[PDB]
Design a protein around this ligand. Structure first.
Ligand SMILES: [Mg+2]
Ligand SMILES: [Mg+2]
Ligand SMILES: [Mg+2]
Ligand SMILES: [Mg+2]
Ligand SMILES: [Mg+2]
Ligand SMILES: [Mg+2]
Ligand SMILES: [Mg+2]
Ligand SMILES: [Mg+2]
Ligand SMILES: [Mg+2]
Ligand SMILES: [Mg+2]
Ligand SMILES: [Mg+2]
Ligand SMILES: [Mg+2]
Ligand SMILES: [Mg+2]
Ligand SMILES: [Mg+2]
Ligand SMILES: [Mg+2]
Ligand SMILES: [Mg+2]
Ligand SMILES: [Mg+2]
Ligand SMILES: [Mg+2]
Ligand SMILES: [Mg+2]
Ligand SMILES: [Mg+2]
Ligand SMILES: [Mg+2]
Ligand SMILES: [Mg+2]
Ligand SMILES: [Mg+2]
Ligand SMILES: [Mg+2]
Ligand SMILES: [Mg+2]
Ligand SMILES: [Mg+2]
Ligand SMILES: [Mg+2]
Ligand SMILES: [Mg+2]
Ligand SMILES: [Mg+2]
Ligand SMILES: [Mg+2]
Ligand SMILES: [Mg+2]
Ligand SMILES: [Mg+2]
Ligand SMILES: [Mg+2]
Ligand SMILES: [Mg+2]
Ligand SMILES: [Mg+2]
Ligand SMILES: [Mg+2]
Ligand SMILES: [Mg+2]
Ligand SMILES: [Mg+2]
Ligand SMILES: [Mg+2]
Ligand SMILES: [Mg+2]
Ligand SMILES: [Mg+2]
Ligand SMILES: [Mg+2]
Ligand SMILES: [Mg+2]
Ligand SMILES: [Mg+2]
Ligand SMILES: [Mg+2]
Ligand SMILES: [Mg+2]
Ligand SMILES: [Mg+2]
Ligand SMILES: [Mg+2]
Ligand SMILES: [Mg+2]
Ligand SMILES: [Mg+2]
Ligand SMILES: [Mg+2]
Ligand SMILES: [Mg+2]
Ligand SMILES: [Mg+2]
Ligand SMILES: [Mg+2]
Ligand SMILES: [Mg+2]
Ligand SMILES: [Mg+2]
Ligand SMILES: [Mg+2]
Ligand SMILES: [Mg+2]
Ligand SMILES: [Mg+2]
Ligand SMILES: [Mg+2]
Ligand SMILES: [Mg+2]
Ligand SMILES: [Mg+2]
Ligand SMILES: [Mg+2]
Ligand SMILES: [Mg+2]
Lengths: 59, 137, 117, 204, 122
RNA sequence: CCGUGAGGGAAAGGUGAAAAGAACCCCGGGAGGGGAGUGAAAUAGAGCCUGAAACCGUGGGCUUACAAGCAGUCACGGCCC
RNA sequence: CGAAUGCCGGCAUGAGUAACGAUAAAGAGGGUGAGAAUCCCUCUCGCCGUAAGCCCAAGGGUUCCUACGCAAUGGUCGUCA
RNA sequence: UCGAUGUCGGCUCGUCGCAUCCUGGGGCUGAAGAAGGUCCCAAGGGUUGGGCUGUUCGCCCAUUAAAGCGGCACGCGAGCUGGGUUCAGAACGUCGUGAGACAGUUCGGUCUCUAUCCGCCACGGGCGCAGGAGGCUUGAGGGGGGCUCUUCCUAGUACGAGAGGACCGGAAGGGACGCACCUCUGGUUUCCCAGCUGUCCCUCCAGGGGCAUAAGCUGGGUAGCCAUGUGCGGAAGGGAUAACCGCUGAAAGCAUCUAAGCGGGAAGCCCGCCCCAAGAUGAGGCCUCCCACGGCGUCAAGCCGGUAAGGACCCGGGAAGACCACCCGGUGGAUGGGCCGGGGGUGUAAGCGCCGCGAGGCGUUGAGCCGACCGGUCCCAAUCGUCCGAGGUCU
């Protein structure tokens, strides 16, 4: 109800310009040197991990 | 470069490893006290030694005597031109490293609490290199 | 202006000492712990210290490990399964890897702490 | 005009036999000149200096070995001395002689968003007698409707530190060119490991 | 670091046991008086048959402080009560004596009568 | 629904001719879709006829990052229809 | 109809901003599941313990329990409730 | 303006004026000297701490070189206080028959988490700067600081009807104020160490842990950050000036600082000193690195796809930091974590043995534990990579 309040409605211009830098950055993906799935980097993602990595279900 | 404090120790050629390595026991000897146009003024100092803060060089130790009606603490740099800093009684036995508890009490409880470091006052006396084996061999 | 300085925190003191104890009780038991990454990066120093205390096979080291790990049935397993397992690896026992398939629903990066073989 | 690049490596009080001069230790190393900025192609009569040469092939396109002892360019990166003119090469410390004052210019220890009562030494507010949420606030930052704005030079909360600051007239108390040190009396700005340029004096 | 409203265990034979530092006598708006400086002091306690009385606003040199007087030679003296000597307005002591120790900054501050008259200039 | 209570006291209609209200797939846990099918019509598909506007998107044209404004208007000029 | 600090409905802006409702405190391993910090179990950790534990009245009314669920209600998610 | 412009004072932050309270100049002086008075220039810097009052203002106290007069909504309540004042309660004096009233006192009395735009302090993203990049830097334009005293030598001599005491200079210390920094002094240091309590637990003794300010408490506490600490700074030095004094000299044969000219001269002005700073569309300069056209026309084509020099993405980080940036690294690597050594903090660990009925004392033991600090050491983590990135035709 109180002390700090919007004096005016921010229009489409200033609202959709303040929502410029809230565009999301696409994630980083690298192709996993064992088989070609797109892990993020430095990440033991569900293929093998690193060389001799900690396994989900594999030999 | 990669020796950011080996530099700081090699820069310290000012060190004085000739003072006794005392724990907070009781050091009583001279200072520099240059005044009156003449340097040669060698005023002693009594007193329990309270704290030895260390930084390798410039370890500055505090010695507190109670002079003439009141306490007085003096924080000597230990690597300045102090001539001698011999200690009367390597004593205390001193559980506390930095013993500021003798501020609030200033009395016979000092006697009752810095009792006897009989270990060090035996061994740094029986480190007497004061025999009569010289001028023979 | 802090952080000219050492370790990290999110909880209070008596919660961090017993957060490190609780993750150590599970890393020394199982071996693979899936925390977040900022928990793991200061789990590694604590458990590295516990392994290195246990590398000293003597009794004061047993009591110093027991100062943290209040279980002693665990420290049986430590001192004769984890401590002689290295015996040569001077420092740096546990490893920490980041994960994908992150902590879905709060988005924390999970991390997997193995000891090592 | 008597310039050098160096590292603040710590402070130590040393003794000029009567007092305890509380010096710092600048590691004013042998700085190889890498480009003498001439006044007829630039207008400066300045000299780019260098520092530590062990840069394992992080030396990209400023490879720039156009000096006869270039000493492949430091990631302890180039700075200038603005009115310098050396005579030989790789200026060390011997340009400075003990007893001459220097101005030490370095990046100070940044304190982040060290807001006011820390940045501009404000007197904050009362810690008692009344409300509480103003203990470290600046309070007023202007007047009412005339001017009806904050003056643009206003002291407020900001990025304190991490800007170059120069302490003028620091006595060089000693040099140790056995390991190429430089010892000035007082507070060289910056961390114990940070970069400081050490210039000639602006006394006269 | 004697400041206004300090109490100072007076050390001389004037009549003062304790004086409160009214105003430091350094420059214009000086914050503290350390050892060797002149304060202004209103005598709060009385030796009964004293020369000064309980209220004689009198200048005083500060001879002891609880705060550590960092001497230029690296060491630091530190006493165990703030003390002051009553001073006649030509910067000269008022009493015949002075009790225990003073700091030796008083010689370069210009209080050589106190440093001669005090039994241990520490 | 609010009110202890006396009392106050709302909003909320429309598939299509007929439910023929979507069998069977495919994705998905399902919801929801895309096919197939119904029907004249399914941007008539279920609190479903028409379904405007505010609003929110996407695609295209022109236009802007040295500009100043009650946001227009007049004048030329540039560019796609 | 353009104004009544109008009325009703809608949708904005504020804004992905403040908050998420106690500074008692969580961590891990298995499950289950399509999906998990949140569900179950285990093992530590913590918190109350003149209660933050039991029992009975007042009141509320089926919230009890089990099984099938998760759109909706849980200030997140939710197989749980 | 009453569909609200919150209102006195204080705190905080200021900023400005000059009609100046000091400080810098100067003129006269009933100006011997020291003072001072008055007036002219002069805001660049200051302009204290208190007692009383709600007080602005005053009276004092102790200083000071001076304790400026104001403005800025009697600056400042989307900053705070509410003591006062303008709420209800109460009371006193008084007026009122009375309810009640009193800038007449007296006591008490809700002063409202979220900043939308401008403004400001900061820090970024985008794009620009007809090649694209890594560095470095000139400084257009700013901003910051701009103080001032005391003492001494000048000499206690010029002066002095007086014995007080100079101008001109030169040092040495101070006082605040600002910048920067841990060497010292001193704080904090949240688990680094120790002691101790009570309880519970592990395992009974010993030992240890949990809990008791989200540290049980207490004693210490490196690095960090800090001031009360330390070191710096104010300027010298040009140039033009104000008032004010000139020199030369007419108009007016003389004089006059002025009309032609030219000199001194102020803490003031500009530059010097420090910091930012090319977004300075005026978008700079210098050094270095990389450079086809194959493709779709009224053509190196305005649009993409592969390009390098490089830059990102990511990760290890950081005296860098809210995020982002910035800086350092990514196996060739000492970047973080570990271990090792040292500094450092604690203060003789545990265990054993001995003494003592015993709480404990003893040796082993400055031992052990050890947060950052200073370095070593690939032991673990920065594996792997992925993506942008010109090809410049134009006077
Ligand atoms: Mg408010
Ligand atoms: Mg909008
Ligand atoms: Mg958008
Ligand atoms: Mg006794
Ligand atoms: Mg670090
Ligand atoms: Mg920093
Ligand atoms: Mg305060
Ligand atoms: Mg409040
Ligand atoms: Mg309140
Ligand atoms: Mg009397
Ligand atoms: Mg009297
Ligand atoms: Mg009801
Ligand atoms: Mg019909
Ligand atoms: Mg379906
Ligand atoms: Mg509809
Ligand atoms: Mg319809
Ligand atoms: Mg569009
Ligand atoms: Mg322009
Ligand atoms: Mg343009
Ligand atoms: Mg116009
Ligand atoms: Mg309408
Ligand atoms: Mg109307
Ligand atoms: Mg109308
Ligand atoms: Mg409405
Ligand atoms: Mg809405
Ligand atoms: Mg906001
Ligand atoms: Mg916010
Ligand atoms: Mg929030
Ligand atoms: Mg608790
Ligand atoms: Mg409890
Ligand atoms: Mg149930
Ligand atoms: Mg749902
Ligand atoms: Mg839900
Ligand atoms: Mg299920
Ligand atoms: Mg009004
Ligand atoms: Mg209005
Ligand atoms: Mg005269
Ligand atoms: Mg004037
Ligand atoms: Mg002023
Ligand atoms: Mg004012
Ligand atoms: Mg006002
Ligand atoms: Mg208010
Ligand atoms: Mg306001
Ligand atoms: Mg009030
Ligand atoms: Mg109140
Ligand atoms: Mg009457
Ligand atoms: Mg009350
Ligand atoms: Mg904002
Ligand atoms: Mg002089
Ligand atoms: Mg310190
Ligand atoms: Mg206990
Ligand atoms: Mg417990
Ligand atoms: Mg606690
Ligand atoms: Mg400390
Ligand atoms: Mg003449
Ligand atoms: Mg002239
Ligand atoms: Mg200027
Ligand atoms: Mg540029
Ligand atoms: Mg370590
Ligand atoms: Mg040590
Ligand atoms: Mg022992
Ligand atoms: Mg026995
Ligand atoms: Mg060590
Ligand atoms: Mg250090």
């Amino acid at each position: 109800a109180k002390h700090p309040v919007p004096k005016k409605k921010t229009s489409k211009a200033r609202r959709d310009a303040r929502r410029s830098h809230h565009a999301l950055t696409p994630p980083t993906l690298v192709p996993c040197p064992e088989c070609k799935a797109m892990k993020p980097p430095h990440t033991v993602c569900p293929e093998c991990g690193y060389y001799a990595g900690r396994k989900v279900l594999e030999v | 470069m990669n020796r950011g404090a080996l530099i700081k120790l090699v820069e310290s050629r000012y060190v004085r490893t000739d003072l006794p390595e005392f724990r907070p026991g009781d050091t009583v000897r001279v200072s520099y006290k240059v005044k009156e146009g003449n340097r040669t003024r060698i005023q002693d100092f009594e007193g329990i030694v309270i704290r030895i803060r260390r930084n390798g060089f410039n370890t500055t130790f505090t010695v507190r005597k109670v002079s003439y009606g009141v306490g007085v603490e003096r924080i000597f740099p230990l690597h300045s031109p102090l001539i001698q800093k011999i200690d009367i009684v390597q004593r205390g036995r001193a559980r506390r490293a930095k013993l500021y508890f003798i501020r609030n009490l200033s009395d016979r409880e000092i006697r009752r609490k810095l009792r006897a470091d009989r270990k060090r006052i035996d061994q740094d006396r029986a480190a007497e290199r004061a025999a009569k084996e010289e001028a023979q061999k | 202006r802090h952080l000219k300085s050492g370790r990290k925190l999110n909880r209070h003191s008596s919660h961090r000492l017993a957060l490190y104890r609780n993750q150590a009780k599970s890393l020394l038991t199982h071996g693979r712990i899936t925390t977040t990454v900022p928990k793991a990066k200061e789990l590694r120093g604590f458990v590295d210290h516990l392994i290195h205390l246990a590398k000293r096979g003597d009794l004061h080291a047993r009591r110093l490990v027991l100062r943290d790990l209040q279980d002693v049935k665990l420290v049986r397993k430590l001192f004769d399964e984890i401590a002689p397992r290295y015996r040569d690896r001077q420092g740096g026992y546990t490893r920490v890897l980041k994960l994908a398939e992150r902590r879905r629903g709060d988005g924390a990066p999970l991390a997997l702490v193995e000891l090592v073989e | 005009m008597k310039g050098i690049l160096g590292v603040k490596v710590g402070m130590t009080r040393i003794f000029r036999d009567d007092r305890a001069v509380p010096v710092t230790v600048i590691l004013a190393g042998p700085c190889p000149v890498v480009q003498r900025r001439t006044p007829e192609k630039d207008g400066y009569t300045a000299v780019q200096l260098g520092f530590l040469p062990q840069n394992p092939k992080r030396v990209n396109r400023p490879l720039k070995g156009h000096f006869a002892k270039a000493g492949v360019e430091p990631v302890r990166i180039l700075r200038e001395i603005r009115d310098f003119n050396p005579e030989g090469d790789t200026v060390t410390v011997e340009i400075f002689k003990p007893g001459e004052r220097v101005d030490v210019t370095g990046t100070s220890k940044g304190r982040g968003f060290a807001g006011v009562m820390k940045r501009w030494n404000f007197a904050g507010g009362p810690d008692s007698h009344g409300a509480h949420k103003i203990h470290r606030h600046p309070g007023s930052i202007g007047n009412r409707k005339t001017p009806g704005r904050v003056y643009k030079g206003k002291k407020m909360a900001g990025h304190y530190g991490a800007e170059r600051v120069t302490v003028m007239n620091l006595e060089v108390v000693d040099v140790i060119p056995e390991e190429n040190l430089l010892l000035v009396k007082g507070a060289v700005p910056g961390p114990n490991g940070g970069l400081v340029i050490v210039r000639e004096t602006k006394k006269a | 670091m004697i400041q206004p409203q300090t109490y100072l265990e007076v050390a001389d034979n004037t009549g003062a046991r304790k004086i409160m530092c009214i105003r430091v006598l350094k420059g214009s708006n000086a914050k503290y008086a350390t050892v060797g400086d002149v304060i202004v002091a209103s005598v709060k306690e009385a030796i009964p048959r004293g020369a000064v009385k309980e209220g004689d606003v009198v200048k005083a040199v500060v001879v002891r402080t609880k705060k550590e007087i960092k001497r230029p030679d690296g060491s630091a003296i530190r006493f165990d009560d703030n003390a002051a000597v009553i001073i006649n307005n030509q910067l000269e002591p008022r009493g015949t004596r002075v009790f225990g120790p003073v700091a030796r900054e008083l010689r370069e501050k210009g209080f050589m009568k106190i440093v001669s008259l005090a039994p241990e200039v520490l």
